[PDB]
Amino acid sequence: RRGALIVLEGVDRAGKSTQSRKLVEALCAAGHRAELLRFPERSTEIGKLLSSYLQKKSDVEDHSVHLLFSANRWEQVPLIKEKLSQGVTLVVDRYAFSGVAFTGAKENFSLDWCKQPDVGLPKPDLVLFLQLQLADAAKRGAFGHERYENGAFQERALRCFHQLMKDTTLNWKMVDASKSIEAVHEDIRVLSEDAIATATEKPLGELWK
Template identity: 50%
Template sequence: MSALVKSRGAFIVLEGCDRVGKSTQVLRLLEALTEAGVPNKVLKFPDRTTSIGKHIDAYLRRKLELPDKAVHLLFAANRWEVEGEMKSDLLSGQTLVVDRYAYSGVAYTAAKKVAPLWWCKAPDIGIPAPDVVFYLKLPAKVAEQRDVYGDERYEQVGFQQEVEQQFEALRGPQWIELDASRNIESLHKDILAKALEVIRAVDRQPIGELWTDDAVVQSSS
């Protein structure tokens, strides 16, 4: 396959509840894009290597307790930490493949019922907007059967079902829902085909900003 040279890279996000196979599909996509000659870079949120990310890591491993709203703001700050780097990478022609993004931050906090959806979205207003979101959907009862389920704070079936409902409320026109119970290779082929379409389509389009046109968020915040 010939290399795809574009004026900017595409911003590709994989979302979904815990243990649906996002990390596996991210790796498969990166390998395929590299083989296709597409400059690419992977990001995973939360980024546990940053100063803020280390606090998040301790929280997720149950080694640190924090109020729910404070945790939410930490997750948002963790994304803003690399906002400038993300834009620079995209404008240099690199395609970003991101494992979880602001949608997860909003869905998980909203599922706790500690704040309305508009409040949860507000800290991420203006962050770079994805060109496509691959939403991997899998029943929580099925995900529960996968290896090491339950190792981290949020891996509880009842809570994951609440998270799924919040994801449904966040879906937008750039979202593509995929059945995560399918064969890994079949799922990968569908993701790759659409990803290549998006990479070609963004061409010289400007980088979007997340939720800046959301009237409900703007009026409520």
């Protein structure tokens, strides 16, 4: 009885990391086997390169950094498949959607080019998109100092995310992340419980193919 693959995507400070952490806690407390994953996974050799880039400690050519971001996902595929096959549900803070939206926001990068490197990855059974108005997000303190943390770029990435949500091959669910931490959590949790039950009667799919 395989686990589900649940990905959390969304606007800056919408609460991806907070709701991913809380969801795995809630699932486990409800007797599911569940574990948390995040992308980029900064602990591998490729992950370190990406971390240094996001911190402006190094500069990486745009195409190369996009392929590293996808290679960082592929290096976890054997683990992902093994865990799901063992019945472990995986909650993932960012996935290939962030990869296409962040590079796709840069000048001269088509959405088709950006998607290719991730074609074939495990397909999520559920892709939550945490929505939030900037007036609301701004009250979530201030922009960080990492790369991409400015409003003009974030707004181009959102545009790309909206192009990705047109793809009906995927189970997108919008979440109103303007509510309190606990109210957004409850919305997410119920969607997740439904996906772990049903979504899983079908074999794990392949993304964008």
